[PDB]
Design a binder for this molecule. Structure first.
Ligand code: 1FZ
Ligand code: MG
Length: 426
DNA sequence: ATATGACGCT
DNA sequence: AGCGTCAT
């Protein structure tokens, strides 16, 4: 394998929600502006920021009323609200558009709402003998950088770009249809044309990674951004990882990586390499001394599971602070309220994808519990009717109340998560 | 007081 | 089945 079988990409839309609202209300174009959920408490919570607005310091998970103190001429599109919660239809609609476009090129896996990994390996082959040995001109990759290039014997940003591109193509071996670096270059032209096509047909710009496995392609994606792609070649990796902080590797963002530093005593992805696959396992998993040991050597094998369609549909809403729920009548209302948008989507799912969910998950968080899901009770799901799901998901949870008046509810709930899983082909 | 989906482990 | 972890 040597971390060079597949050709894998990760496309990712640049401030996805913001572009969607930027394409709708065009005054928002080329202006610093963010998108917000809810309006009462301090102007709303941010979730997405145009890059002209990150220039002032505006981050997500920040109060719109605070980021207005960071940015003065910062515009504000609010996410459509329905039944007192977030109605993200707009963006899922935009999402299905871009994935229809991408799917035309290679088998893709829907990563997030705005991300898709692509398995270009099967495609790069069906082109290398379908062009004889074409020189592969620079004009075909007008948005690609080559991480780790150019080497060296008054440049601006695009000056430096051309340079590394021509260094790539110069040592290119358009003859060796086997060389791994050459196929990288092929998948990249494809991603150039994929990326060029999405803009052509949605107006949405995005950024890509092109490399040999899921992980490199993601880290590659975020390097040059926005409206750019990076081709982290197998040879880039020792330079790229030498100073890459370990937490920037997908899967290493959470606890595992946190302890990886605290146990091994390091900070960068390169520092992780001075250990045996045996040695690492004793400090971590039997699967994690392994996975790490290949990763820090630029090798990963988790395949692009081709799947453009989520396995689960779910509606969630938080009740933070003094807005937690403490009434039998209050919990019941929202569970219906949640069940009402859930029906809507499930029917949208039925007549779109020809499938139907079978089990319902009801989940709640509690004021106090150091947990997202303090409870998660998985039940049955026949007909797509809210009142049925409403009452049934309630009767699931009614027996963890500890108020001795049954009109009230305690400890109050911070979250209701209604989630439909197990879609059968009917 | 920063709405969602994927998966792993038991 | 039901928790815990990771992610956008
Ligand atoms: C991380 C995150 C994202 N989102 C929404 C908003 C994003 O616009 C959209 C994709 O999130 P992203 O890919 O992490 N960031 P972005 O697409 O807005 O900006 P960029 O990719 O860094 O250019 O999903 C949430 O609603 N809650 C969250 O916690
Ligand atoms: Mg994005």
């Amino acid at each position: 394998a040597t971390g060079q079988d597949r050709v894998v990409a990760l496309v990712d839309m640049d401030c996805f929600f913001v572009q969607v609202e930027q394409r709708q209300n065009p005054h928002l174009r080329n202006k610093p502006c963010a998108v917000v959920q809810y309006k009462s408490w301090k102007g709303g919570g941010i979730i997405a920021v145009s890059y002209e607005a990150r220039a002032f310091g505006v981050t997500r998970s920040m109060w719109a009323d605070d980021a207005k103190k960071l940015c003065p001429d910062l515009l504000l599109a609010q996410v459509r609200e329905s039944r007192g919660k977030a109605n993200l239809t707009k963006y899922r609609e935009a999402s299905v558009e871009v994935m229809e476009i991408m799917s035309r090129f290679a088998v893709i896996e829907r990563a997030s709402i705005d991300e898709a990994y692509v398995d270009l390996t099967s495609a790069v082959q069906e082109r290398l003998q379908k062009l004889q040995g074409q020189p592969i001109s620079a004009d075909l990759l007008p948005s690609t950088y080559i991480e780790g290039l150019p080497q060296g014997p008054t440049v601006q940003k695009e000056g430096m770009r051309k340079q590394g591109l021509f260094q790539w193509l110069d040592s290119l071996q358009i003859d060796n249809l086997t060389s791994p670096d050459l196929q990288l270059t092929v998948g990249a032209v494809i991603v150039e044309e994929m990326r060029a096509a999405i803009e052509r047909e949605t107006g949405f710009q995005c950024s890509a990674g092109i490399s040999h496995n899921k992980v490199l392609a993601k880290l590659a994606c975020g390097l040059n951004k926005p409206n750019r792609q990076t081709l982290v070649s197998h040879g880039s990796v020792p330079q790229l990882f030498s100073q890459m902080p370990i937490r920037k590797i997908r899967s290493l963002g959470g606890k595992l990586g946190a302890s990886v530093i605290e146990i091994l005593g390091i900070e960068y992805m390169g520092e992780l390499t001075q250990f045996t696959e045996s040695q690492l396992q004793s400090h971590f998993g039997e699967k994690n001394g392994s996975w790490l040991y290949a990763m820090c050597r630029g090798i990963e094998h988790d395949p692009v599971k081709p799947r453009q369609l989520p396995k689960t549909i779910g509606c969630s809403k938080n009740f933070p602070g003094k807005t937690a729920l403490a009434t039998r009548e209050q919990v019941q209302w929202w569970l219906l309220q949640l069940a009402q948008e859930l029906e809507e989507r499930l029917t949208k799912d039925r007549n779109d994808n020809d499938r139907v969910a079978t089990q319902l998950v009801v989940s709640i968080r509690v004021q106090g519990d150091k947990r997202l899901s303090s409870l998660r009770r998985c039940c049955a799901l026949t007909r797509y009717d809210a009142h049925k799901m409403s009452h049934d998901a309630f009767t699931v949870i009614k027996n963890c109340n500890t108020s001795g008046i049954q009109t009230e509810w305690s400890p109050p709930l911070t979250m209701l998560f209604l989630c439909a899983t197990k879609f059968s082909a009917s």
